[PDB]
Amino acid sequence: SKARKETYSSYIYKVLKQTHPDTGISQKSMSILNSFVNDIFERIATEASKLAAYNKKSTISAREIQTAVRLILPGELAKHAVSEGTRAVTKYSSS
Amino acid sequence: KARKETYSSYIYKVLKQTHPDTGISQKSMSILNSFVNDIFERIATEASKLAAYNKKSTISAREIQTAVRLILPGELAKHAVSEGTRAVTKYSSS
Amino acid sequence: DNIQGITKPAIRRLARRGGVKRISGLIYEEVRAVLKSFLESVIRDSVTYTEHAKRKTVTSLDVVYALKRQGRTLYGFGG
Amino acid sequence: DNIQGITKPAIRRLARRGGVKRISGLIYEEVRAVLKSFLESVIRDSVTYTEHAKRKTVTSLDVVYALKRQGRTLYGFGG
Amino acid sequence: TPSELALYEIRKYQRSTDLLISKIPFARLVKEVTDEFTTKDQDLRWQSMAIMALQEASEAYLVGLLEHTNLLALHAKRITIMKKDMQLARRIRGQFI
Amino acid sequence: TPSELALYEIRKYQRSTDLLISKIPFARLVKEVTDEFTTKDQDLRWQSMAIMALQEASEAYLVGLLEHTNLLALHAKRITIMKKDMQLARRIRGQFI
Amino acid sequence: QSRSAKAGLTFPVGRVHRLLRRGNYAQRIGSGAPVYLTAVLEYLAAEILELAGNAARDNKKTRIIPRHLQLAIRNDDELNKLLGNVTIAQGGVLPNI
Amino acid sequence: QSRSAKAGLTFPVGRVHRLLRRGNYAQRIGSGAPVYLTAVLEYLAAEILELAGNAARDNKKTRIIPRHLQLAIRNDDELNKLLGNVTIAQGGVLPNI
């Protein structure tokens, strides 16, 4: 048997449709970008909860994630990342 | 009397059994304490990792046996596996 | 036995990719030495991973895992 | 000019701990530069750790966590 | 043209995106390395995919070390690399020496 | 004896176990680096102990890079280090270049 | 209505939520954390794939390939710091000039 | 009777067990894991501390100091692989010849 495997490939392809509607993706490229988000997710979350443990505070929260991303990303990308995280969570909380 | 904990006294008596005459400076003691902390962190992160890898809810003595075998160079690894097996056997006593 | 299969013209081609245009001999045998070291280290790591999984097929999961353990994350194949 | 206040006899004696005895003059300026770069990054990491911790006094645990994340982990302090 | 042909050759396998070591050789090499590392009784299988990832890591490291060893030769005001030269380049990079 | 005195000097600060940079300079240096990195309104204090650990990490890295840059000069068959020489040594070590 | 839709995100905020639960990083998770993390991941993915698409435009073809990805990631000097440790599958290596 | 006492190990294995609990390494903490790793840690500490004893003997200072610790741990060739990137405070560096 073979269990259903987690993937973000549909979302990756959709955002590529938004960017370049005429462009497709190779299978190897799609596996590569599917691995991108999981690798980033891990190296953000571990650092964020380690920072939370340094705070000796129970909850991993938005401030912890913001700090973790701005720690680990190179600064030029970090500015964009924190701005987009903040505006996204604000748009959500405005619901 | 809100006491505070550390590895310093336990490390000190370890040094006593190895060499009762030899003393230790407090900063060397801090180096040893942070050494035990760092190796604990390494082995425990490897334990969490291997547990997620085998999709196991828990940390097994055998999966951290494996983690030690990954982390340690061969000589220290063989010594550590022997020591840990001995200590598991002796802790099982009561 | 087959480390010689990684042969002097082959490592010459590797060095063309590297950007050299002059190469002496003994470079060659020790390139085999470093390749031996890399292969055995990562192989040991992946082997330990699978045998702790009580499997006997060292698997790409364990190889990309051993590579991340070695500090270099080969990237593209899940992981 | 604090990094110039890091004096050139100082950089010299550091070279002599470094095991060298002859060092060009612009090494002094560029050893100042390398100290500047490493200090800048470790200060970034430790200051940000401090900012998140809400104790806005920069702490030794912040410094050692910075060095640890950098891979330059230092002993005797987180213990 | 020797130089023109060989430099063109650098560029074409430099921008080639793919692995380039001989394959059946590399596969049997890893197979025998596992066999000798493994023992009498416990033997280990290898699928396509592990062999894959092993290959790519080996290629990438040796090419990285290759520009560095080429560069230490460049620093010697020469264009041959030698034992001592690369031996050093790698060892200065630290791991495995 | 110039060589005898200077080599003896290497050995005595080589086996000296302690930090050796000028202290009030280093402390005010970190203080102003924090001040310039920090902004208008949020300002940050420093105790003895953070300044300590910062110092030791800086000392250790610069001395490590120092043997490496000395060694790249040794590889140039010379004993002066230059901009390009060390610039490279560090940059080959990778981080911060 | 889905959480991703309410956020304006394309990526699966709910999957990031449940994965944070699987990754045992902390026992209590703020509700804003998964959406913030999903937004960050979506931004990074969009940036890298846009760079790869422009690389494909440079290569004059309408499908992304690992060579395009490797060229983009290596050329962007910030994402090369972010993924300096990564080597891409069938990604190759960048030229000397 | 105590679990930390019946363990026959210096470091209290109860503290290690509850550290593993709050360390989020997994949902359940196998009771043999903390005692095993405590013993491994105790043996490694025994290595460092018998080096401390013989360094105190060699250097004639009865109580071990960080200089001696750094010298012994840097002389321990196999252990430096574990502690390669590691550096020690107030330890200086072992003499290069």
Author numbering:
A (entry chain d): 34 to 128
B (entry chain h): 35 to 128
C (entry chain f), D (entry chain b): 25 to 103
E (entry chain e), F (entry chain a): 133 to 229
G (entry chain c), H (entry chain g): 17 to 113
Show sentences the authors wrote.
The point centromere of budding yeast specifies assembly of the large kinetochore complex to mediate chromatid segregation. Kinetochores comprise the centromere-associated inner kinetochore (CCAN) complex and the microtubule-binding outer kinetochore KNL1-MIS12-NDC80 (KMN) network. The budding yeast inner kinetochore also contains the DNA binding centromere-binding factor 1 (CBF1) and CBF3 complexes. The inner kinetochore centromere-associated inner kinetochore (CCAN) complex (14 to 16 subunits) associates with the centromere, generally through specific recognition of CENP-ANuc.
